[PDB]
Structure formats: C-alpha cells, structure tokens
Design a binder for this molecule. Sequence first.
Ligand SMILES: *C(=O)CCCCCCCCCCCCCCC
Ligand SMILES: *C(=O)CCCCCCCCCCCCCCC
Ligand SMILES: *C(=O)CCCCCCCCCCCCCCC
Lengths: 457, 457, 457
Amino acid sequence: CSLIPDYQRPEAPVAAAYPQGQAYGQNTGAAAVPAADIGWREFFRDPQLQQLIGVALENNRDLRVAALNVEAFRAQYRIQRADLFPRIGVDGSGTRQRLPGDLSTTGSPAISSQYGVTLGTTAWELDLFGRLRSLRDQALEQYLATEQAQRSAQTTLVASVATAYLTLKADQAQLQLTKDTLGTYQKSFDLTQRSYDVGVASALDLRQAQTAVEGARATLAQYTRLVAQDQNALVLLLGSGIPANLPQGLGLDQTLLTEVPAGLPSDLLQRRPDILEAEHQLMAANASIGAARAAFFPSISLTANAGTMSRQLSGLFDAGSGSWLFQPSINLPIFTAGSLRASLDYAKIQKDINVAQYEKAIQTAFQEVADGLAARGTFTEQLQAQRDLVKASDEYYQLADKRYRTGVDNYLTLLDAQRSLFTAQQQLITDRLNQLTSEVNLYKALGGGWNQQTVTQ
Amino acid sequence: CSLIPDYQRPEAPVAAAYPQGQAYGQNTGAAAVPAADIGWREFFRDPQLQQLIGVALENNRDLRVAALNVEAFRAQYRIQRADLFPRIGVDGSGTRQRLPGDLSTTGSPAISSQYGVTLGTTAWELDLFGRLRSLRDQALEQYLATEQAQRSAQTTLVASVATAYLTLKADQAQLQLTKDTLGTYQKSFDLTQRSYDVGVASALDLRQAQTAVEGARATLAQYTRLVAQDQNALVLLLGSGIPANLPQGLGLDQTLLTEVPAGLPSDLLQRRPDILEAEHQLMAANASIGAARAAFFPSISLTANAGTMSRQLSGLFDAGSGSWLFQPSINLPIFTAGSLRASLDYAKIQKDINVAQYEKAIQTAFQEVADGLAARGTFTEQLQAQRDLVKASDEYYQLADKRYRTGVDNYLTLLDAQRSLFTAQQQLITDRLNQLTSEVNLYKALGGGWNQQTVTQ
Amino acid sequence: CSLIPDYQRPEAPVAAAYPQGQAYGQNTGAAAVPAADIGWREFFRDPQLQQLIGVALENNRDLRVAALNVEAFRAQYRIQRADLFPRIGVDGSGTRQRLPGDLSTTGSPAISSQYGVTLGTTAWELDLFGRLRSLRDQALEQYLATEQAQRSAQTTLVASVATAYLTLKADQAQLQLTKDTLGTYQKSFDLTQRSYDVGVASALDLRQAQTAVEGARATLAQYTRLVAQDQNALVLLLGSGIPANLPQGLGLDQTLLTEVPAGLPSDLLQRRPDILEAEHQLMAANASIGAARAAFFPSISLTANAGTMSRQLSGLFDAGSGSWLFQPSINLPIFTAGSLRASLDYAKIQKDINVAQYEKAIQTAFQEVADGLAARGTFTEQLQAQRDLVKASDEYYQLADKRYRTGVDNYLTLLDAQRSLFTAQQQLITDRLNQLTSEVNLYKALGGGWNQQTVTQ
Ligand SMILES: *C(=O)CCCCCCCCCCCCCCC
Ligand SMILES: *C(=O)CCCCCCCCCCCCCCC
Ligand SMILES: *C(=O)CCCCCCCCCCCCCCC
C-alpha cells in the first residue's frame, strides 16, 4: 500500500497563444529550437561579453549559494530516505535500584541490578502503508525542485550580466559623445569670443554660448560618474575583477544577439526553469498528503536486538550470558479530536496552495514574455524613427551652424539646434539599450541560458 | 488556571490628528462612513473597471494563495485544539526474550513472553495549569490574524488593479494624442515641402519641420509599446484573459470614484486590515508567554488502557484474559539551567517584538495616508494649473501657426510652440493619473475594498 | 573531545585596493580613523539634523525590533547552553494493573500496583564528544551575529534619516525657488499686459508670457506636494512627530559634513557591520558540523533519581520506603542508511554556503564604496560646472530681459532665457543633494554611525 494521490498537472490558465496586433510581430508558432535549448554563447555574439558571462558563472557567489542549496536538498532527501531502514546499534545499559520491603522480591529492602550490552534497533517503523515512502518523496521533490531553481537562477545571472555590460558600454558611448560635444562646445564658445572683443558677437550671443558650454561641462561629469557606477555594477556580478586579457569588445550599434523564436506558450510548461521548480514544489506537497493519510493507519513499530546480560557486570562476556529481545508492536488510532483529519487537511490545502502557485508562476511568464514581444515588436520602429531625428537635426545643425556666422540668423536657433540634436543623440543610445534589454530579458523568460551551447533533438 | 497575561493594546504612537496646512485641506474629523465600510463597487464608478476587479477577485492566484493560507491556519488551530483531548486507540504488542540464568526467574535460561491488545491512551496530558489552552490560543490567534491578512491582501489586489487599468487607459490616452499630432506633424512637414521646392520654405525650415515630425514618429512607437506592456500588466492581476463583454469603459477626464472621508487617525485601529493582523499577531505571541510560564508548573501526564493480555498468543480472546492499566504521573522541575527562564524570556520578548511591530504598522499607516492627503490637497490645484498651460499653449499655437505661414516670423517659434504645447498635453495626462493613483491608494490606506458593497451601522 | 573544525576566514575575493582613475580621486591609503570609528554627531554638522537622528534612534520601531531580536538570540543561546546541564525534577508516578492468570505472580487474576515520588533526572546526556558544546556555540554564534546585524541596521537608520531630512530640505529649496520665480513670472506677465492693452505687447508675446507663468503656477503645486511627502517620509523614520524645540537647521549650500577617509578595503573586514554578521553567521554553521560529526559517536545517556516508593500509597513518607535508581546507558550506532553521512554533509554544505555568503557580502561592500568614490570624484566638478550654467543663465537672463523690453528682440529669447535658467536652478539643487546622498551612503558603507561620538586608538 501507498497513499499518495495521482499527480495531475493543472491546465495552464493563460491564453492558448500569445496576444497579438497592437505592437506584436507575427506569432511564428511552434519553434523547432526553444530559446531554452539555445545557448547564450551562441545567443550572445560579443565574445568579450560572452567571456564575462564565463567569469560570472565560475565566480558569482549568489549562484554558488544557489548551487550548494541543491546539495543541501539532496542531502535532506538522503536523510529522509534512510528512515525506511532500521537504526542498528551496539548499546550498553545498566540499572541499579534499591527497593523497599513491599517491593524487593526478598520481602525486605534489597537492591536489584540488570546489565546488558546488545546489537539491535529500537522502535523501527515498518512501512506497510507507506507513511515513510511518502515523506521520502516529499523531500525528493523538494530536492528536484531545488535543482530547477538553480537553473532558474543562472539564467538570471546571465541576463543581469548582459544587462550590466550593456548599461556600462552604453554609458561609455553616452560619454565619448560628451567629449566630442565638449571640444565642439568650447571651440564654438571661443569663436563667439574673438568675435566678441571684436564686437561681431554681442554679450547675449556670448552668454548663450556660455550656457551651451556649461550645459555640457556638467553632463560631462555625470556620464563620468555613471560610468564608474556601471563598472562597479559589473565586477560584483563577476565575483572577480575584470581580467586584462579580454577579447575585443564591440559597440551598441552592432548586431550582438541571435533573434530568438518565441514558440508556443505551452512550450514554457516543459522549459521555463522556475515553472518546473513550481511543479515539483507542487509535487512534494502532494506527497505530504500521502504522509498525512497514513497516520490514519496501523503503524507497526519494532524494537529488537540481541546480546549478553547478567545481574552483576562481570558475567557479561562469559558463557551462557546470552540473551535477546523481540518486541514488535501494532498501533491504530480510534480517537484523536479529529487531529488527524485536521492535519490531513492542512496538507491537502498546502497542495492546493502550491497548485495555485504553479498557476501564478505560469501566469507570470505570459506577462513577462508578452512585455518582451511588445518590446520586440516596437523597438525596431523606434530605432529607425529616432535614427531620423538624428539626421534631420545634424542637417538642422550644419545649416544653422553656418547661418549664424553668416549674419542672417541669431544664436538662439544655433543653440536650439544643438539641443534638438544632442538630446536626440543621448536618447538614441539609450533607446538602443532598452531595445537590447527587452531582448535579453526576452531570451531569459523563454528559458534563458542554462545551456552554454545550443542543443537539439 | 491559565497564565496568559492581560492583553492591553498599546497606544498608537502617532500624532492625534493628521497633520495640517502646507498642502492639506481641512480635517473633516470623524467620518460617519469609514472608507473601510465604503465598498469599491461604489467607490469605483467605472463599471467596466468594477467588473475587472470582479474578475481579478475570482481569478488572481496570489489572493487564492493568501486565502487558502487562512484555511491552513484554521487547520493549524484545529491540530492544536485536539491536544486538550486524549489520544485513544486499539493497540497490540508483543515481547519474547531469552534471559540468562541469573535473570530468568527459573534461575536457569528460560524464554519469557507477554502479549497484549488493549484500547487506551498513553501519556495524555491533563491541562490543569492551562499550558495547552495557551498554545491553543496562540494558534487561534495566528489563525485570526491570518484572516485579517487575507483582508489586507484583497484591498491591495483592488488598488493594484485600479492602478493597472489606469496607467493602461492613461497610456491609451497618451497614444491617440500621438496619432493626432502625427497627422498634424506630417501635414505640417508637407506644407513645408511644397513650400520648399517652391522656395518659400528654406532648407532650415525644412529640417526643423523634419525634426518635429521625426520627434513624433518615435514617441509614437514608445507609447505604442507602453500600451501592450500595461495590457500585459493587467491580465496577470486578472488571472484571466480580459473577457469580451465588458461594459463601456470611461476616460481619465471623467470623475471615476467617490471622494472619500479621511476620518480620524484612531479610525485606522479598528478598520485598516493589516493593523489588525498586527494586533492579533501581537496577541498570538501574548499567549506564547502563558505557555512558557506553565512549564514552570506541575505537568500532569496520564497513561491508561484496558483489554486482554496473556503469556502465549491464543489465550487472548478467551476467558479471564481480561487486563488493564492505570498509570498517572505528576512532574515538577526543580532545576533546568535557567532553561525555563531563558525560554520564558524568548516568548516574552517575542511579545515585545510584536508590540513594536504593531507600533510600526500603525506609524506606517499615518505616513501612507498623509502622503495621500498632501496628494489630495495639491493635485486638484496642479490640475487647474496644468489645465492652463494647455490653453495658453494652444493659443500660443494657433497664433504662431498662422504667423509662421504669414512670413512675419520663422519656424523656430512654430516648433517651440509645438514643444511647449505637446509637452503640456502629455504632462497633463500623466498628472491626471498620478492624482487618481494618489486617491486609490488613499482609499486603500484607510481600510480599502474588503467590501464589494458599502455597509451601515 | 570537541569536533568543531578550525575556523579559517576566507580571503576577501575583491581587488586589493580601490579601483582608480576614470572618476576616482587619490586613494589616501590606510586612514588613521575608519569611517566606522567616526561619529555621525561629528560627521554630521547640522545640529538640528543631529537631533533628528537622536530622535529617530530613541524611537524608530524597525530598529527596536532589530534590537529585541538580539535579546531573543541571547535567550536562544541561553536555552542551548542549558543542555550541557541535567534536568532535575521532583516527580510522582503511580501504576495499577489487573493481570490475567498466566501473568499475575499469583497464577490467578490479581491486581498489582507501584507508587513513587522521587527527585531526579531522566535521559541526561553526558557531553563527552562535545556534541552539545558544539550546538551551544552554534546558537552563541548566531547570537553574536544578530548583535552585528543590529549595528548594521542602525547605520542604515541614520543613513535613511540623513537622506529624508535632505530630500526634505532639498525639496524646500526647490520650493522657495518657485515662490520667487512665481512673483517674477506674474510681474513679467502683467508688464506684458499693460503693454498689451497698449499695443506694445502683441498677443503672441502675451500667450508665451502666459505659458511661462502657467508653467510656474503648475510647478508650484508639485513642489508643494513633494514636501509634505518628504515630511511624511520623516516622522516615520523618527518614530515621533518632529519636536518643536529643534535647533537652527542649515541650508544645502553649506558644508554640512566631514569629508571622510576611505581607507584600505581590508579595513571593511574589521569594521563594516553586515560583513561581520556574515562572518559569525558563517562560524555558526561552522559549529553545526561539529554537532553533526558527534552523532557518529557514542552518546552517553543517564536516567537517575532517588526518593521513596511502595505498593500502596500510604507508606510513602513512612519508614524504609526509601528507594532510588541509577540507570546509565551508552549507545553507538552501527548502521543508519547513510543517514549520518547525509546529515553530516548537509551541515558541511551549510558551512560552505555561509562561506559563499561571507564572500558575497564583502563583494557588495566594494561595489557600494566604489560607487561612492566615483560619486565623490565627480560631484564636486559637476557642482562647479552647474554653478556656471547658473551664472551664464542669469546674465543671459538680465540681458535678454532688458533687450526684450527695448524692442531689439522678441519674447522667445526672453522665455528660453527663463527655461535655460530656472531649469539650471532646479537641477542645481538636485545635484547638490545627490552629491550629499552619495556622501552619506559612502559614510555608511564604510562603517557608518554605530558611534554618536568619534573614538580612537
Ligand atoms: C495494504 O493494506 C496492503 C496489504 C493487504 C494485503 C494482505 C495483508 C498483507 C499485510 C499483513 C500485515 C502483517 C505482517 C506485518 C508484520 C511486520
Ligand atoms: C492554578 O492551577 C491554581 C489552582 C491550583 C491547582 C492545584 C491542583 C488541584 C486542582 C484540582 C482540580 C480538579 C478538577 C477535576 C477534573 C475534572
Ligand atoms: C574524546 O573523548 C576522545 C576520548 C579519548 C580520551 C582518552 C582517555 C585517556 C585517559 C588517561 C588520562 C589520565 C590523566 C593523567 C595524565 C598524567
């Protein structure tokens, strides 16, 4: 006999297929390679970055923690498994009481004494109904589930390292742009100086020029700080100072990652890490019902051993001192104040809770992937659209640039051209990044990179 | 006896009445209707949204979770309650040992044997001092508390759903604004294209006219994305794909809720969910001192049973095999290494912790409501004040619109009109939301939606 | 014996010294006083704020909690100490059974009875291999750790309060700047009203002049709200409404704190709080291996007591009734299905996990200080460079101010002067703050304020 019920994974309560239209590309359908099976070494192309992932994996503690965390639950599974088996031991015991008149067999105050040394168990429970096999399962699951959770955690170390490198490099490009426009700003302000002591530039076109230059001298220092902060942001996730012998790193403008299929939603149910932890996490608690159930049932204890006894010590390892005990026991509950029903329910409930929980994780995937397909299905278009506000403004730069020094126009159109452009340059870089984020997190949500390499069928 | 001490709820260590002045309206005083008793189906007027709340209730797993949680702690209370009662059962046991000479009663190796099937309890505790009623109350409390926390949770589900539907609708409204100003922008650029190949529009006035249009073409894509992101944001909290047959949903510009009375601070204590869990939480640990105390006291144990025995199996259910046992026990400790003291302390402290925690939650309510009263007491004012920067800009738009195509002026003052307007438009939508937000959160803070309906004394 | 392994604090896996260069000042080297040893009543110079810290110390509930927690862990340690010691009790027990023929000593149904009242211990474990001592140390450690963590959390209450006071004052300075430029803006608009009903000011120059004043009347209400929100932010951390009798608080422009030495990283290991909790946290589980080891070894039980007994109650405290027992026992397991291996692993692992955690905490310290040194090594320069964009913009304000009313120029170069100035003003305050922030947090990460006073050598 064994009392665990029939696992029956619930039906994923999200839409059968991802929603569409209002920013969503076409639904490619069943993918022949899941993102899950697509290794980040492939999905990331930037090899200097790739080898940063390398270093983060082999170093980041929070992943270590999450790795050991498994070794624990295997160990905890072990301990549970043992309890199917009987605890055998060598054991010596004494006893040496005075009794009173009415008690000693002598009818008068005497002092009994028993000694024994033996090899056997006390109170071994003989799983007939599998109260134990159940428990063993609970912890087996809670183990397996932990395995998953580890996988779940790496994909996130990867993603977060991608991301960090990116805000780092991105902020690096947010910087050099500031260098260029610093030399530019100051050269501009110096040609509105000779031209001032020469009266051609007024004090207004001089103060303006000063607000440009100063407007830059500030966003210099900022994208300096936010460079070091992004650097610090990195070595952490690394667990190692960044090595010197890094490969040649690329630049945001490139094409750094593979475009990844989004498959069906149902796909998740066999591939998204946490969503499996969830499942086993559920499974364990289902076991815990079996365990509960069995407490309604006859438990068969068994004490038993064998060795040598006597009345004084001395005659222990001497002839005939041989002894032994056989002491089985069958017990069965007739009244607890529904204690049993009560803590059977607690367990059934806890199942249900984990059912619910499975369902929450699932329904959170849909969300997190959809957000990334909105993002996929919008960011490209925003990338062309902002690419234009660069050109239009670089021309609307050159033209006003010359037109100011040509007496036709003022400085306010020179200046405002500079805003209308610089803004478009920063926001450009940043837009690039967040398209990247969007894709990296998208990579994750569909199964991320447990795999270094890509694998098939 | 029962050594649980006298609960004496502390005094809510915040200001007596909500602070005033620097952005706070008038303090209406005791409200005849607590926001608490005011049901969201009333406090929300948008019936489409209302019914979304409905769906999010019947569906969200996170609530399911938190709801079961109760049931668990009920069962947990059950389990503790059964402990007052004796654990009764059928029970069979054997024993069958060889003894050595000095130990068998025959003075010579013989083999004893005892068999017994009885119906009784072992070491049942009589609750005299109420160590057990104590635990029972601890568990009852951690249960009741858990009821509260469920209520707390739902209010946050409501609030968060209102909010989602909102930023969703607010980004919907953020969008059509960009449809409009897209057709507007391109119309404008094309009337600065005929006018270009015709020489009336320069190349500058063609490149600015290109950056307005371009600056739009991207804020299109963005508010196209941040719409699917907010959509995705919804079905989650829904736990269900949004049904088709929803009523007619309204628009931010309306008047979607009931203004809510802010009542007195004192009011929180009897109505704001979490602030009760806190209390009961505190109360649970209060009992847990009772418990500790009692282990200083005489504990009464009791083993007792009756049925048949014998010296070989067979003669069990036969005549005279009748047996029984009565075996009472009294224990009173006269030395642990101050164990009982130290472990009493723990539970005392733990009460104190929960007192402190009660106080925390109280003082966090004050804050979170007051923030909503600065919010109430300024958002309307920023709503009129921003309503103006729309009109003044729409005029400073019609004007410069004509004035540019009338050759009096340039394009820079057409463009800057466009900025200084569209800016005020978006900022207006967002300021609408944030006012709303602030009010939903305010609703919550004062006792939120437990009740679908609004109920009287 | 004592099987607790030999603690060996791992080597702090970060860079030997603070990263340098791309925004980092000079690395002053070992500091003669750690930021740790330096007092916040000295590091902070605003004495009004200083007494805000005083207030938030003597009150804040979250720190209280955090403090009680210690006491509880002392208590828990206590209880674990006690187990070295034997559990002594006065104790009474009875027994009264009807046997059947073959079992009664009378060969025919009769009813036995035994009574006793004795002062002793049962099953006291003699700590030989120090399994218990081990545990004692475990809970001692986890206690000591809890001590550190408390200190940890105080530094953070300070930091959070410095902060809230700041963003408070910073938002106040953000406000009066708005009062000023409101009287300014309305004056301006009315001088472009007399001049409008007089023809000199156009209708465009009146709608621009209307969107300035309207852009201000708006940013009034906002910075009015985010001051009551930054107020509510404060009394919370305070745990008390802000006293009337505070001293004279300063203004962001001052020099409110002591610049602090950032010493060697190594210094962290001996001074930054959480990094210690972790260490002890590590040490605790270190002991936990000792404890596990020992279960491989013989355990030595000892039931033992003394008193008076008899066969009927009566002759209890009557002559001869004297009795006693001595009943020692040694046990050594020979087989558990690897249970002891497994549960030894779990404990070994749990050490290694705490190793990992020590390492991660250290590695987050680096990060959080480096960020503060980028910050320290940039904010000064962004402060001079933003100081300039103020002057350049107030000049480029006075100029265009007179120049507009002197007919030479339009209003757009009055308005854009106003933007390019006021924006520089707001962002100037904000920048002041974020520098301050960066510096408070810096002071925290390197030991923060345990000490009100500064101590040395
Ligand atoms: C679930 O009840 C499975 C068993 C029922 C089938 C037949 C009976 C077999 C078990 C009898 C138990 C007695 C022997 C146990 C001694 C240790
Ligand atoms: C706290 O317990 C104070 C009272 C003293 C208790 C001492 C022991 C005597 C109690 C007698 C109770 C009889 C009740 C019978 C059970 C149904
Ligand atoms: C851990 O408990 C290991 C157990 C082994 C202990 C060894 C016992 C040795 C006994 C001799 C001690 C006599 C002391 C005289 C010294 C001069």
